[PDB]
Design a protein around this ligand. Structure first.
Ligand SMILES: Nc1ncnc2c1ncn2[C@@H]1O[C@H](COP(=O)(O)OP(=O)(O)O)[C@@H](O)[C@H]1O
Ligand code: BEF
Lengths: 702, 97, 95, 92
């Protein structure tokens, strides 16, 4: 509540030796201070004798400490190279980039008229700023709000005025309205035009929408699947007048995409998400209700669509369970694989009418999921050599409806070609030692014998597989192949050398390097990725890593930095589950596999992130299949796995009391009929019934 | 809540008593055993409970220890459990020499 | 009022002007009152409707915010009195 | 003073560094002493180690007198029984 220091933004000189002391900063440095409990916008260039003891002293001192040494490592030393000057400055540059975006406001939450100390009352708006979550939204008065972001305020009024809440939706519960085949693209697609395989998809979802049945979207990995739902959401809203708060659950990795995908393909319905913690938890509820608390279920209704991470489902299962929902969206719904899932019966409690999964999950790996999917969409509904025809007579005829199978043979005609090459790498020197000795406890127990015990099975069928191509995944390996006792050339050479795969990768990489292709590395193991992190920097190739350990904000920054027109790094390394998590790469052509991902198809999506509709540079894929190892066999089982892949009466006096006041306020009100009804002023009656009453009422008047 | 001097001291104690959850985590402990158990024999396996059970034993074993330790500690004009306070306790029980 | 501003000031409402025509001076009202303030007052109803005045007073665009007091004048009726008089006046209603 | 393809992997589940110190104090207060010495709590784990071995010693023995790979929880019980710390609740 007090005026105290919150953070550091910017640092500059105040006044016209070897190391600046703190005094120098006090008598020769001015620092931009952001104040506590107050938006970014009011930042002051202040010193220490200027403010004196103010609550909060800690961050400036250290930051100055960081500053003092920083000064000794840019201008005040001759061990500094060319490149460190680039980073030490660079930080100044990026530290401000993450500070600039807070000044631009992004949404106005509410508007309160609060009194001042001069006896005046001024309007204030709860303002939300860019790429930040709902917390630290402070009140700012309206004087300059439109004076910097007119567009936000224009839109701020529009939603409040656009009476289209879940308050007027048509009763089609009992039975439906006959629905129509669309030819044309709906006058609700501002994002552009779609094609001849995105409007029909939509016409099936909406086509079994009117049946009372739910369906499975099973298309290829990225055939404008997201556009088909958003448009599916859009046409179920201005078609059958459904204001029904639609619930959508998507991955924490793939939502930011969705939002923009939702706010650019369909302006007029607003999209408020759920991605906070403790504080947010409250702000969601601020706008999730009207008029504070509410008897019964009499919430006036201020949203329709939401996006939920999978976490958050389970953390607050209860509140959603109570509120009614009749339409469901989920992203990459191969989650419901087993029928013992926690989200598997978590979803069943949410009073629901129609569902909508949309993933390319292959449905022959196990028959469990094939059944689980069928049991989940439709609770209740469900081999022999010569009965197989009898069997698919039952399975083909029944499964199809709630299924979609459609090949690329679309939009791929423009997109440059797809390709994948295997790699037979035979074993090395130090390699056999630990391919041979490890399958016993001979020299595996002499060196690291205490650990031998726990990894002994790990190493057999879930390591040898993983530690067959590369033995560098334990401790007593690094110096084993390096034959000497600081060297820089040798370490680089010693590490490239041990593996069949490291050399093969180093040369191909070089081979395309001079030709110009952007290369991708998908590794199964977290560490491999540091391993390379250590080597590629050394040999000077600009890169960034994509692990399982990164904040949403940080994940998002680089993904974009990469697909921008003029980005230097053609090397990008990714995960199997963390890599194929979600996202798309449109600049990339080449993708290389170190080891198969203990399974058929984790790779098939793994290449899906790079091989998408956009890519204009064909495609290239390399699989490093190890020889005379254990990699070979799974590769064969993997094959075994993927072998199959298949009127309201009349107007009463009180309304007549309602209509009369509205005329004194708005004059002729025949034009404004729906806006008033959406909000309190009018009951739902047909447009004419009011209009005639409006006219006779003056006719009586004259 | 009165002032602040020795205010929590007795507070946490009470809340901990009403509860009945494991004092020590159930993840570090799990390996600690696996790791020594190897030194006395090879190729080991573990029942889910077996550890659960050890945790129970051990935790309970220590508390008990501390419980005396406390007394000893009191005897001494002190409210501080000490490195030895531990020893006497054990010595007189007899595992400690 | 909806008709005249629509056919001369369409693209931008606020430029709306009185010119010569003279509507009464309001000397003793608590705050600065001058023809420009009336100019906005009318646009304000043109935008929000008669009788909602907090709407009008708060608007960032109008700039009327600390000249309204809904002992301090003019309050809600004072404006109510203000518009009926101006609207009739410029069409020639008081004939 | 080099990146040198550096990879860092160190061990903190099982090993005593890894385990949590509050996990102990959590334990200390149930007894309800006011103060914890730094020296002391280190010793305490020390003893835990001493108690823990002997049991497993026996455990291991009963697992092995029967030629079994899976260690039974009963196996632990008898162990405790031998030192006179038998546990009700388990494995009648
Ligand atoms: N049917 C479509 N019509 C027009 N543009 C599309 C269509 N589908 C996708 N796009 C464009 O391609 C990009 C990614 O879409 P898509 O490939 O479906 O997402 P994902 O990476 O989930 O597959 C988007 O940025 C979008 O502009
Ligand atoms: F169809 Be996607 F990978 F969001």
């Amino acid at each position: 509540d007090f005026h105290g220091i919150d953070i550091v933004i910017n640092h500059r000189l105040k006044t016209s030796k070897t190391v600046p002391d703190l005094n120098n900063c006090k008598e020769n440095y001015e620092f931009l201070i952001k104040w506590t409990d107050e938006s970014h916008l009011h930042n002051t260039w202040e010193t220490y004798e200027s403010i004196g003891q103010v609550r909060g002293l800690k961050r400036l001192d250290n930051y100055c400490k960081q500053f003092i040494i920083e000064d000794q490592q840019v201008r005040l030393d001759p061990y500094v190279t060319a490149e460190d000057i680039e980073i030490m400055d660079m930080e100044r540059e990026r530290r401000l980039d993450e500070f600039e975006e807070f000044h631009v406001p992004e949404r106005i939450i509410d508007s309160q008229r609060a009194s001042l100390e001069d006896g005046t009352s001024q309007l204030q708006y709860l303002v939300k700023w860019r790429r930040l979550n709902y917390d630290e939204a402070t009140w700012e008065n309206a004087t300059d709000i439109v004076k910097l972001a007119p567009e936000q305020v224009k839109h701020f009024q529009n939603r409040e005025n656009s009476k289209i809440l879940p308050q007027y939706s048509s009763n089609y519960t009992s039975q439906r309205p006959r629905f129509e085949k669309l030819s044309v693209q709906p006058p609700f697609i501002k994002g552009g035009e779609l094609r001849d395989f995105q409007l029909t998809g939509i016409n099936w979802m909406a086509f079994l929408w009117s049946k009372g049945d739910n369906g499975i979207l099973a298309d290829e990995m990225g055939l404008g699947k997201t556009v088909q739902t958003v448009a599916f959401i859009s046409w179920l809203i201005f078609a059958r007048r459904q204001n029904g708060p639609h619930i959508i659950v998507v991955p924490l990795s793939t939502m930011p995409a969705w939002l923009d995908t939702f706010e650019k393909w369909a302006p007029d319905l607003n999209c408020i998400c759920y991605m906070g913690n403790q504080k947010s938890r409250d702000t969601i509820r601020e706008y999730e209700f009207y008029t504070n608390p509410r008897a019964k279920g009499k919430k006036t209704m201020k949203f329709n669509v939401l996006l939920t991470t999978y976490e958050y489902i389970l953390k607050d299962r209860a509140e959603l369970g109570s509120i009614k929902w009749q339409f469901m969206a989920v992203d990459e719904a191969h989650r419901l694989k087993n029928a013992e899932s926690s989200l598997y019966e978590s979803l069943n409690s949410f009073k629901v009418a129609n569902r909508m999964l949309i993933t390319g999950t292959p449905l022959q790996n196990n028959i469990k999921e094939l059944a689980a999917l069928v049991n989940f969409l439709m609770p209740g509904r469900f081999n022999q050599d010569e009965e197989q025809e009898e069997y698919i007579h039952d399975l083909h005829r029944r499964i199809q409806p709630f299924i979609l199978r459609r090949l690329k043979k679309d939009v791929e005609k423009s997109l440059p070609s797809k390709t994948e090459r295997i790699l037979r790498v035979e074993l090395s020197d130090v390699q056999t030692e630990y391919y041979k000795n490890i399958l016993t406890k001979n020299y595996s127990a002499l060196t690291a014998g205490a650990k031998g015990g726990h990894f002994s099975l790990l190493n057999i069928m879930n390591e040898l597989k993983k530690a067959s191509n590369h033995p560098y995944l334990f401790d007593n390996a690094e110096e084993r192949v390096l034959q000497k006792f600081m060297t820089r050339e040798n370490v680089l050479r010693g590490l490239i050398m041990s593996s069949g795969k490291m050399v093969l990768l180093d040369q191909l990489l070089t081979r395309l390097k001079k030709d110009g292709h952007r290369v991708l590395i998908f590794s199964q193991m977290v560490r491999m990725l540091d391993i390379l992190g250590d080597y590629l920097s050394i040999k000077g190739i600009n890169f960034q890593r994509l692990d399982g350990t990164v904040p949403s904000a940080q994940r998002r920054i680089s993904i974009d930095h990469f697909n921008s027109p003029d980005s230097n790094d053609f090397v990008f390394l990714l995960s199997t589950r963390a890599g194929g998590l979600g996202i798309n790469l449109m600049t990339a052509d080449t993708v290389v596999i170190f080891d198969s991902d203990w399974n058929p198809q984790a790779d098939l999506q793994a290449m899906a992130r790079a091989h998408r509709i956009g890519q204009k540079n064909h495609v290239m894929v390399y699989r490093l299949v190890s020889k005379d190892t254990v990699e070979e066999e799974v590769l064969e089982r993997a094959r075994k796995k993927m072998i199959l892949e298949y009127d309201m009466d009349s107007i009463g006096e009180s309304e007549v009391r309602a209509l009369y006041k509205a005329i004194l306020k708005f004059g002729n009100l025949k034009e404004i009929l729906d806006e008033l009804i959406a909000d309190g002023t009018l009951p739902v009656k047909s447009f004419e019934k009011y209009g005639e009453t409006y006219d006779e009422m003056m006719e009586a008047a004259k | 809540h009165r002032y602040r001097p020795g205010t929590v001291a007795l507070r946490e104690i009470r809340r901990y008593q009403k509860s009945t959850e494991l004092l020590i985590r159930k993840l570090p402990f799990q390996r600690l055993v696996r790791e020594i158990a190897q030194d006395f024999k090879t190729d080991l396996r573990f029942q889910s409970s077996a550890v659960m059970a050890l945790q129970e034993a051990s935790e309970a074993y220590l508390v008990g220890l501390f419980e005396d330790t406390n007394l000893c500690g009191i005897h001494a004009k002190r409210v501080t459990i000490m490195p030895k306070d531990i020893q006497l306790a054990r010595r007189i029980r007899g595992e400690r020499a | 009022l909806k008709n005249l501003i629509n056919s001369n000031y369409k693209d931008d409402p606020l430029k709306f002007s009185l010119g010569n025509n003279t509507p009464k001076p309001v000397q003793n009202w608590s705050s600065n009152w001058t023809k420009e303030e009336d100019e906005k007052l009318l646009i304000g109803v043109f935008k929000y409707g008669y009788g909602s005045w907090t709407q009008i007073r708060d608007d960032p665009f109008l700039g009327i915010t600390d000249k309204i007091f809904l002992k301090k004048v003019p309050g809600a009726i004072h404006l109510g009195r203000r518009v009926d008089y101006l609207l009739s006046f410029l069409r020639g209603g008081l004939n | 003073g080099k990146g040198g393809a550096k990879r860092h992997r160190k061990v903190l589940r099982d090993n005593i560094q890894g385990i949590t110190k509050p996990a102990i104090r959590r334990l200390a207060r149930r007894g309800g002493v006011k103060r914890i010495s730094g020296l002391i709590y280190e010793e305490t784990r020390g003893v835990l180690k001493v108690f823990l071995e002997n049991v497993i010693r026996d455990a291991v023995t009963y697992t092995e007198h029967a030629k079994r790979k899976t260690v039974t929880a009963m196996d632990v019980v008898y162990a405790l029984k031998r030192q006179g710390r038998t546990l009700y609740g388990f494995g009648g």
